[PDB]
Amino acid sequence: DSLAPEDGSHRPAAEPTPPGAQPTAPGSLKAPDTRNEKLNSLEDVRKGSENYALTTNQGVRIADDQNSLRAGSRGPTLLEDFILREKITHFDHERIPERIVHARGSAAHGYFQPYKSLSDITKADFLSDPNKITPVFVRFSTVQGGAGSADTVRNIRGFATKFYTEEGIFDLVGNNTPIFFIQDAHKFPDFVHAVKPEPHWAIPQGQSAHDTFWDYVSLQPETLHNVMWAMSDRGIPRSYRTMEGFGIHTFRLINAEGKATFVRFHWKPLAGKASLVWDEAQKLTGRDPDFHRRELWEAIEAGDFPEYELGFQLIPEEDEFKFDFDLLDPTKLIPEELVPVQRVGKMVLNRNPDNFFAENEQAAFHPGHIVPGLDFTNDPLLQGRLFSYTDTQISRLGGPNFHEIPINRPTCPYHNFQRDGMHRMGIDTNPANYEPNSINDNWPRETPPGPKRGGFESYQERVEGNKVRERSPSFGEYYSHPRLFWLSQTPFEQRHIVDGFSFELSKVVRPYIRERVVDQLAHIDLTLAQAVAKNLGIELTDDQLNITPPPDVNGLKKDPSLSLYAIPDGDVKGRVVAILLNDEVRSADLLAILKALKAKGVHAKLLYSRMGEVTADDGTVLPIAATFAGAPSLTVDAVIVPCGNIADIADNGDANYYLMEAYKHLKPIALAGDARKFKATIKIADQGEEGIVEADSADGSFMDELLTLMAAHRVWSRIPKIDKIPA
Amino acid sequence: DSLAPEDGSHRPAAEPTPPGAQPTAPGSLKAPDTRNEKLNSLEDVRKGSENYALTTNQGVRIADDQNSLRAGSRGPTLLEDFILREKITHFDHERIPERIVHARGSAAHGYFQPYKSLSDITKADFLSDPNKITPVFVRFSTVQGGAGSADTVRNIRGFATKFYTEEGIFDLVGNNTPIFFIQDAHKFPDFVHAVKPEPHWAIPQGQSAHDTFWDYVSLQPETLHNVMWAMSDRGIPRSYRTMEGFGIHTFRLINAEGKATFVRFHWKPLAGKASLVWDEAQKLTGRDPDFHRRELWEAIEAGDFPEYELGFQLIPEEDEFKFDFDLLDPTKLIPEELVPVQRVGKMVLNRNPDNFFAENEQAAFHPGHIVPGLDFTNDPLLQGRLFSYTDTQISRLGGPNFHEIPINRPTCPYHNFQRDGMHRMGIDTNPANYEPNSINDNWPRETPPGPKRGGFESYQERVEGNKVRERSPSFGEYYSHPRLFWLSQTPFEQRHIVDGFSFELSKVVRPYIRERVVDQLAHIDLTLAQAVAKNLGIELTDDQLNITPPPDVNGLKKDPSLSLYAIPDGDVKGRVVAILLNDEVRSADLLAILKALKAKGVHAKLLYSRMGEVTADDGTVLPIAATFAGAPSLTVDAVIVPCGNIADIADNGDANYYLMEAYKHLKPIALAGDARKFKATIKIADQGEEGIVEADSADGSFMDELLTLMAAHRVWSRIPKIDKIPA
Numbered sequence A, B: 001d002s003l004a005p006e007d008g009s010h011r012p013a014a015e016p017t018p019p020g021a022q023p024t025a026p027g028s029l030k031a032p033d034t035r036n037e038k039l040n041s042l043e044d045v046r047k048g049s050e051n052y053a054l055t056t057n058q059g060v061r062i063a064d065d066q067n068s069l070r071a072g073s074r075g076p077t078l079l080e081d082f083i084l085r086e087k088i089t090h091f092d093h094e095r096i097p098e099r100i101v102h103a104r105g106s107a108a109h110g111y112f113q114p115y116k117s118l119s120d121i122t123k124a125d126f127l128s129d130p131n132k133i134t135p136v137f138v139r140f141s142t143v144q145g146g147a148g149s150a151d152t153v154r155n156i157r158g159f160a161t162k163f164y165t166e167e168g169i170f171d172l173v174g175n176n177t178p179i180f181f182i183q184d185a186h187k188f189p190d191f192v193h194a195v196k197p198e199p200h201w202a203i204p205q206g207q208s209a210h211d212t213f214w215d216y217v218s219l220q221p222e223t224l225h226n227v228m229w230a231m232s233d234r235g236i237p238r239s240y241r242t243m244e245g246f247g248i249h250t251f252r253l254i255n256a257e258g259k260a261t262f263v264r265f266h267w268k269p270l271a272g273k274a275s276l277v278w279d280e281a282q283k284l285t286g287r288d289p290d291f292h293r294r295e296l297w298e299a300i301e302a303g304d305f306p307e308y309e310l311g312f313q314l315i316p317e318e319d320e321f322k323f324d325f326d327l328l329d330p331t332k333l334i335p336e337e338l339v340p341v342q343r344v345g346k347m348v349l350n351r352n353p354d355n356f357f358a359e360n361e362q363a364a365f366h367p368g369h370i371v372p373g374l375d376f377t378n379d380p381l382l383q384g385r386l387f388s389y390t391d392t393q394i395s396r397l398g399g400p401n402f403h404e405i406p407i408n409r410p411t412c413p414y415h416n417f418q419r420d421g422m423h424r425m426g427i428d429t430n431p432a433n434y435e436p437n438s439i440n441d442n443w444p445r446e447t448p449p450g451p452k453r454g455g456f457e458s459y460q461e462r463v464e465g466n467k468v469r470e471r472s473p474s475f476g477e478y479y480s481h482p483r484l485f486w487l488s489q490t491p492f493e494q495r496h497i498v499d500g501f502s503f504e505l506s507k508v509v510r511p512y513i514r515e516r517v518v519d520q521l522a523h524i525d526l527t528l529a530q531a532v533a534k535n536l537g538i539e540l541t542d543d544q545l546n547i548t549p550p551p552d553v554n555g556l557k558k559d560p561s562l563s564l565y566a567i568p569d570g571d572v573k574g575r576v577v578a579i580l581l582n583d584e585v586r587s588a589d590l591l592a593i594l595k596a597l598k599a600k601g602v603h604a605k606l607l608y609s610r611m612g613e614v615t616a617d618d619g620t621v622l623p624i625a626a627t628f629a630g631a632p633s634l635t636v637d638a639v640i641v642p643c644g645n646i647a648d649i650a651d652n653g654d655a656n657y658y659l660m661e662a663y664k665h666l667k668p669i670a671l672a673g674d675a676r677k678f679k680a681t682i683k684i685a686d687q688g689e690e691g692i693v694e695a696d697s698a699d700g701s702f703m704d705e706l707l708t709l710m711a712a713h714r715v716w717s718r719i720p721k722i723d724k725i726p727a
């Protein structure tokens, strides 16, 4: 019509900008200069808008997109209105089935590069040269809830990476913990049904805190290992940038000489590991159910590209049987103290999608998509997965041509004798649709395996045994890995695990199920079991108190790589601070605060009791990002209250509650000058407290001290003190 | 061999039980004796489980449902495992497309009956006989979010009723406000795309608080009336039992003589009208995203059957043009002060479904499904709806045989010459599949229209006009109905409206969009417009301050039926009270509390700082429903604190917070004996406060006071006091 504002302010800057500074936008508009081979290959299907006429799908220009055709301006709508019917038809058919699991997920484009050639252990082309760059598309997800459920639920997270290599798509489809719940794929519908909403009423969404889950767990101790991980703060990551990734299964690397090496895949977050606390996570599902999705997108728009290091645990074929646990058992992890992770390469996620539906929702990842240089093993969970991903994609994406949906296409050549199916895009000119043929001189042709550009040939593993439906006896140990995990956690991590079990079991309506789980905990660790029992009003029996603890794992009592926090890795870049304003802020404080944060790549949001602007002591006009209620402390990592007319907000219950919530969730707080008046709301003593930064002004060491706390993520020593505060 | 406990406590009693007393269960097992003709006819497809062997879908008993078939017990899974593949295949294909809108919804079975014969105004069979009962299935829903999004979002709500009548299915597909946002169906995809998650990043879920919605609103002032309703407390109902329903459009009733009467449909909740407050609603999306779903299912299990009264506004055909708005405009309401709602019948929802997916998810409602005695009008929104419901059901339910899906099936005869289509269940024996035919003597035959059991004939409305895509000039007024609604709300309801607009607009990133919406508000009411602007730090211009208020609606400056609360209608049956226990509770208090609650059908939840049991002063063992943190005050209507060992909980952070939250949210609080020591955390009054019930002991008088407060729902007089409290 001519509907935009004259200043051009409807349009975000096509340049990196902090979160909240500009409206977010399709990736190709936001970052037009950020390219890779896959992103370039999608140009053929990207559709613009500006300066084009509005048409039907058939290209007929529409004159009046405001009205149906009727007989009289108050008359009945006419069936001949093809423009109305095409328009409503498309709308009526917008939806496709969501993924059966991991329906909720958020995705981005990036690139991967190896640090050195891995030719000695694998002929995989994408790992053959440090100068070889592989486009990726990554989706992170929750597990149980639908595509419209909340982000910060307690759940395992999915971490799936599509590598568009020169010799084929390799999908690495992993999670954020190094084991899974179950051993054999045949049980996946039972486990998933147990954790998903219960079938009579479809409650609860996004939660394992209900009877059927804990019933199944109580009857299937193989689940306890991943359940320990889920109940720990691992189940509630601060963001996808701050969690680990794992392939879980042992796979094989195959080199040019035909040697097989056992491998488990790791992703290490270069930003470090960090999680929420449960009360914060749960509240955040209400205040911002899109928190992780938003955080991912805005990090990328800001330039805080999520980076991950790919690492391999490598085990020689001759060492297959050298551990207390079976390598093929996906409920067991391989302790880094026994087998180190060797760094392999770096993955950087640097561009958001243009259209979430077209790129994210239709993306299809499947762990059967491997490339020469890789192979499978007989892990019975993996073995069944290979069937499932292909099968489910045929309904979810509407037939067997899902690889022609643009996000899914290989960047490399694909030719074969497959034809037809729904939505077929490729128009084949081969005279032949079969081989062997003479009529096209047998093209396209098979290719023998070889060191590079060769055909896929399976590693010739020996198979010997009878056709059985039987769990290997080597898989029948359930408690030592849970115990190993438990003992590796810090005291505050352990408390969080106790609290997770305690909260979940309290939602289980049938008391005998709670009892049964507590009994299982008593096989893992008596201290764990006692603390959970106490929280449930349950008394362990003398028999339970006497259950002997499970054996160590190959002589390991603990392994600190299993803790989120035991070995600090605190990166502050990309984190965010709430600044609580008043109507006459000390402009000197604000210059110091904002500049110090910017120097470390830490973002800020200026909050007030209303939107608009406030004016500082010296006339500086300050734009307000959000209100105290609008952007609660849940959404930030720390809080700073500069000096000024504090009486303006000391009376504001919202401002006080802001600090009390941030205090309760162990976040750093800094109070400059008269802001120290807020000490009383949070019961801070005159002399002070570790984790509260206070000075006459925001000058000197004030910002370094606050940033030091932010590097340590949360203020764990504050835990005994929070029990009392009413928040 | 993993079995149930001794007590038979795995199983809920098949009798009415209060919420939390038993695990919930499928409706036919909870209430086996609750029947109606539809519930009975679903028996052909009900599938039991007890004492049956586990099988494949082909009926083959399975020996080992724990393992895949493999070559050796650590070997690869074999392709010949048909039991694994069937099981995984069915799992892989569980999902179907969710509804394009109203994807989130909760449904129940019930029955309808008219108070008297309406044969003088309509020949509809289901309204012909006060002793004739019609089975219903009802689905309530939100609009924007996916099937896994939260219940207590701010949204219009859907209220769809399927009447299984003797002369056909009639679907009355309404919402919880008497108007819609737009005038012509052609704009529906525009409006819906604007309110749905934005297409680049698919944020936000379940919220209109984002740029695209307020952009659309600001450019399409026809939306302002329903937006006013959405921003009021109507947008966050307490329960589906405590909101109104409306068909929105003018339809027709046709009697046996051929006379048309214009009609608008109403549902009146016999439990009264009640809504949440925003902070409570948003927090509840995090603590219990299934709150409404749960509340509906639990009410039904408890015998608090949702009841609604069907009501008609009736306008003679000769009065079509007699209002200062067009009857065919779905953005305009008909004020009850102009045309009263005539009572028509009662609907009672008295059984939950057996399987949520089978019966709720697959139900298909469509406002085109009418019956003889009803007809349409040229309302241009209704007219395009008629195209859309049939069409979307073809992809969502997999084909044209959706009426054969058990929940959708008529209970009355259906016979015609249609054949085939995916998943065809009916096996037709008619030698003929066309008419006219001689080979089957033309059966099934057309039936002339008439007074009863006749064929459908459209009312022969006169149509006169040219073929035009044009909005009727009579639709081009956008401000008077928003104003009428505004002036009819109480002062606290007006405040909440202002707060809704202010909260939403503050999340709009582009400031000019906020300014344009404030400009529209200035066309409705200057007080409204100024209060929002102030919250947004916007100053109205001189011209804005001089915008003439829109005219009254046919002389009305207010209509109190538009307010939720102006006219008392409170009903406490089915509400719930938190009782905060201590470790030595005064049984005399608890006896008097529970006796009084029980007499009015109010439920209780017993809460403590842990699970298990506490023993009262007289030896009564009290099982604990949930913890202070696990079932927050958000989920209850009022809180009572009995006396006993108060020292036990007086310094508990969660206990204090519980009262501070209930206080903030305007809920009645009752404190007995030493529990009065808690008056200090809610930091106000000592002679007492209207809204806080207090006495040395809990008695007849104490409970009467508390129950009177509960009848008035919330303590509006406390609003001035809550700004200060930090919760």
Ligand code: HEM
Residues within 6 Å of the ligand: A098, A099, A100, A101, A102, A105, A139, A140, A141, A157, A158, A159, A160, A173, A174, A175, A179, A180, A184, A185, A188, A247, A248, A249, A330, A363, A364, A365, A381, A382, A384, A385, A388, A389, A392, A393, A396, B088, B092
């Ligand atoms: C090691 C254990 C497993 C891991 C790490 C894992 C990981 C994942 C991830 C990350 C996704 C989402 C991919 C995306 O973002 O689109 C996914 C989806 C899926 N998973 Fe797995 N999964 C595991 C076990 C299984 C098993 C045993 C089965 C069945 C045999 C299975 C069947 C599926 C299916 C059907 C989907 C949806 C795929 C689609 O619609 O494209 N998963 N899983």
Ligand code: HEM
Residues within 6 Å of the ligand: A088, A092, B098, B099, B100, B101, B102, B105, B139, B140, B141, B157, B158, B159, B160, B173, B174, B175, B179, B180, B184, B185, B188, B247, B248, B249, B330, B363, B364, B365, B381, B384, B385, B388, B389, B392, B393, B396
């Ligand atoms: C008066 C305005 C409207 C009202 C009261 C209304 C009400 C509803 C309700 C209550 C549902 C959910 C039924 C259920 O629970 O399954 C629904 C779904 C739906 N509505 Fe409407 N709606 C309106 C306007 C429109 C318009 C203008 C269109 C399109 C022209 C439309 C298209 C749809 C579609 C496609 C569905 C999904 C139906 C299905 O999948 O079965 N609605 N609507």
